[PDB]
From a paper:
Rogdi is the human homolog of Drosophila melanogaster rogdi, and is a predicted leucine zipper protein of unknown function. The crystal structure shows that Rogdi resembles a boomerang with an elongated curved structure comprising two distinct α and β domains. The α domain consists of four helices (H1 to H3, and H6) that form a left-handed four-helix bundle through van der Waals interactions.
However, we were unsuccessful in producing full-length selenomethionine (Se-Met) derivatized protein, due to poor protein expression in the methionine auxotrophic bacteria. Instead, Se-Met substituted Rogdi was produced and crystallized using N- and C-terminally truncated constructs (residues 11–276, referred to as tRogdi). The structure of tRogdi was determined by single-wavelength anomalous dispersion (SAD) and refined to 2.04 Å resolution. The structures of full-length and truncated Rogdi are almost identical, with a root mean square deviation (RMSD) of 0.8 Å for all Cα atoms.
Residue numbers in the entry: 24 to 46, 57 to 63, 69 to 91, 97 to 129, 139 to 275
Amino acid sequence: HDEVHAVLKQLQDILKEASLRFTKQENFILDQVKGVLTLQGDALSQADVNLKMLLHFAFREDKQWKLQQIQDARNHVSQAIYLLTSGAEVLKLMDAVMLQLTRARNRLTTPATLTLPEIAASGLTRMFAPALPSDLLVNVYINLNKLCLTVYQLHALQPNSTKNFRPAGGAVLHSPGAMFEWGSQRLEVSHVHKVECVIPWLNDALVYFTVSLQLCQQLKDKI
């Protein structure tokens, strides 16, 4: 059997192209909310958010917000390459490479489950100039190939309220009516505005992962 080395070469070529995707388009335009986000590798370098009530919020231009899903995916790809560039032996190599690839895909596919207090306390909240008002939260994450911006409008519970208060748990996206404690207040999500844009090089990366995983499984099956 010699096809093992051919497969290892094809994997190295593909994954190096995939790695190049993480290291063209940078500016992305994201109905109630209009965003202009600049994405450089794993760094959200600028975020120009306009909410229709237009309230305008922007990052301070010094600072950048890292998207952990992209950084992690990048490191998984880099490690798949390292495993390659460094019978049952072939199968163990294939399992280790496929493990890195499936982790890279999963990190892009599965954004964090956060509580509303976690969103409010995130450094992302404090990225904005001028500061967000107390009745607005901003969340940003990657959903497979999409850059996703969520803006939550909040409403405090009124005095002598008849409403039942049950604190929301964690969620990727919270629904209107979700409630949480913040400081001396109990707040309800009144509105959820979600805008998203496809990131072409992320889609390219995902396709490369799919191809690579298929090539690994093909080789495993021949042994």
